[PDB]
């Protein structure tokens, strides 16, 4: 049957039958203990397509999204290319049992956007949780926040730590087949060029395939940047970008500069496993500040960064009664070859990709954002588990709604 959920930010969100059953599958077969699942992160929308020559995404459109909706300042954060990880740390196993109802003796958890343990090996998880516990220990975090637990929203690198089957079966398959035939194509045409249905020109063909070849090479360089071997916990990198909740408080009232600052100070000192996030503040009304944003994004992506997440200065923001995106993604030209394809930048391709519709994606994000906020507030005010769970379950169900996967 149909499921209506009520949230503080949106009073009516429908979960349809199809979606509820698709969620029930993954939730009952592979998910962690539902006592830990107090939140699932939302999906995220990209910006309008760019006009600028040979560009699909560009900072200007994301800046304009907020400026035209009354938001004067945005925080741009590096978009780390990993896997979203929700990290909950308790001071000890007695805190987890008391506060969370968890019975298996653990004092923390790292889970994924679908609610599964990130690590197949519990010891490796416990090890990661313990490194975070010590950093919080030494920074004075527990005392300053009067809490014996914390829920962090993070990215865990490298990508290849979770995506190896995708890399093997899809990404590197395109890369080896692509590099091999495209190089051979160039070589044959060059030989044809030197020994020189409808008529074709040999030199134009050679020029075209030379370009297809150079793009394929750059596509391969792009995916490799986010892969490296993991032989122990020290090859990993955790980058928290939100402090979501501590005892008695959901930190959705704090601005993103606060999140960045508080995280850097309480989480990232003297332990290279836990990294700070490169970020900047941008006044979207000011030409000079916008120029800095652009320059900063251009440098980040030229040095191999995926792109940025553009967030409103305040965590939750509204244009009148209209809820706005809590985040807009704006990804690098080279990174996007992994998403739109190695050859998407060629003229005849990139022009056909400018006409994309983000309306549906934007609506899914708002609804998932609203469910996550509600899950966190219900848990922080001590409502029963099934009230927290229905919001978390709701996020999972909406994620099974079909939508363009390149967004």
């Amino acid at each position: 049957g149909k499921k209506i959920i009520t949230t503080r930010l949106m009073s009516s969100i429908t979960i349809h039958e199809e979606n509820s059953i698709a969620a029930l599958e993954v939730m009952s077969r592979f998910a962690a203990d539902p006592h830990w699942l107090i939140y699932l992160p939302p999906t995220m929308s990209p910006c309008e397509t760019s006009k600028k020559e040979g560009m699909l995404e560009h900072p200007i459109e994301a800046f304009e999204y907020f400026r035209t909706r009354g938001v004067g300042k945005v925080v741009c954060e590096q978009k780390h290319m990993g896997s979203r990880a929700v990290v909950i740390v308790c001071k000890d196993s007695q805190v987890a049992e008391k506060r969370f109802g968890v019975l298996d003796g653990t004092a923390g958890i790292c889970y994924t956007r679908t609610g599964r343990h990130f690590f197949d090996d519990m010891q490796l998880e416990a090890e990661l949780i313990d490194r975070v516990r010590k950093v919080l220990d030494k920074s004075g975090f527990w005392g300053d926040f009067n809490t014996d637990w914390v829920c962090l929203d993070c990215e865990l690198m490298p990508w290849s730590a979770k995506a190896q089957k995708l890399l093997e079966e899809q990404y590197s398959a395109v890369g080896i087949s692509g590099r091999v035939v495209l190089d051979e194509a160039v070589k044959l045409l060059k030989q044809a060029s030197l020994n020189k249905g409808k008529n074709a020109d040999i030199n134009e063909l050679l020029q075209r395939f030379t370009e297809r070849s150079e793009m394929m090479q750059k596509y391969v360089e792009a995916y490799r940047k986010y892969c490296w071997p993991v032989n122990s916990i020290d090859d990993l990198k955790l980058a928290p970008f939100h402090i979501l909740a501590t005892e008695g408080k959901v930190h959705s009232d704090k601005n993103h500069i606060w999140h960045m600052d508080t995280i850097a100070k309480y989480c990232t000192q003297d332990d290279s496993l836990i990294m700070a996030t490169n970020h900047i503040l941008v006044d979207v009304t000011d030409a000079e500040s916008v120029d800095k944003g652009i320059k900063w994004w251009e440098d980040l992506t030229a040095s191999g960064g995926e792109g940025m997440v553009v967030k409103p200065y305040d965590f939750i923001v509204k244009n009148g009664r209209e809820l706005l995106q809590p985040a807009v993604k704006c990804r690098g030209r080279e990174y996007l070859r992994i998403i739109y394809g190695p050859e998407y930048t060629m003229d005849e391709n990139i022009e056909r990709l400018r006409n994309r519709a983000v309306g549906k994606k934007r609506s899914l994000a708002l609804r998932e954002f609203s469910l996550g906020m509600e899950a966190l507030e219900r848990f922080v005010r001590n409502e029963p588990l099934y009230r927290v769970h229905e919001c978390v379950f709701g996020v999972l169900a909406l994620e099974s709604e079909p939508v363009d996967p390149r967004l």
């Binding site: 091999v180 051979e184 045409l189 030989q191 044809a192 063909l205 739109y340 394809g341 391709n349």
Partner: protein, 218 residues
């Protein structure tokens, strides 16, 4: 993505009449979801080589999931290669060659190269398919990524065929046998064309020792 055919009996330019394509005139043919190019990287009295190049559009392909947009289809010798062979070498496949009827009627010393044939069953399947037709068969394989040998080897093979065979038989054999390896053909075209390129076996196929395997994969 590439098919080459090489001929060395002087005058080797006779390969041009047999295939009904002038070595001095490169051509482009329209396919579903892209184009095919044919041209001659070499054409002398001693050596002639023809090349058939697939030019698949990744956008139109997908418009006809993330890996519907990013996939190996533009870069491999799938059933698209067969469809292109029929579109470009159709007369030669029939056996007609009014300029050199004698050459078209006998076995010629020929070499073919088929790049990036995806094959789930490995080298073994390729040998079982081509060796009984009398070819000398060379197969080479590839790792997925030489910077990541731990990801292991790809399922791609570049195949070399060499033998004394009629031009029409060489073309027919490749035309019919390539899709046998294409596990995702019924996905990218489906039914209409697949039936069309099984009718062409009406001979040697009934006598091929792998008739079951071949009829199964269709």
């Amino acid at each position: 993505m590439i098919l080459t055919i090489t001929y060395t009996q002087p005058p080797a330019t006779d390969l041009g009449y047999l295939l009904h394509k002038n070595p001095s005139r490169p051509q482009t043919f329209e396919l579903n979801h892209g184009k095919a190019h044919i041209f001659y990287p070499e054409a002398t009295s001693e050596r002639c080589t023809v090349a058939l190049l697939l030019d698949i559009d990744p956008i139109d392909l997908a418009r006809g999931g993330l890996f519907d947009y990013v996939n190996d289809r533009p870069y491999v010798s799938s059933s698209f290669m067969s469809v292109a062979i029929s579109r470009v070498f159709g007369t030669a496949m029939s056996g007609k060659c009014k300029e050199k009827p004698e050459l078209a009627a006998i076995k010629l010393p020929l070499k073919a190269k088929i790049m990036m044939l995806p094959c789930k069953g490995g080298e073994e399947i390729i040998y079982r398919l081509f060796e009984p037709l009398g070819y000398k068969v060379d197969v080479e394989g590839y790792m997925l990524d030489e910077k990541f040998p731990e990801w292991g080897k790809s399922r791609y093979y570049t195949v070399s065929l060499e033998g004394e065979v009629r031009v029409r038989d060489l073309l027919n054999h490749i035309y019919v046998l390539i899709p046998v390896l294409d596990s995702e053909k019924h996905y990218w075209v489906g039914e209409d064309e697949i039936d069309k390129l099984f009718q062409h076996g009406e001979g040697w196929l009934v006598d091929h020792p792998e008739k079951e395997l071949i009829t199964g994969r269709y």
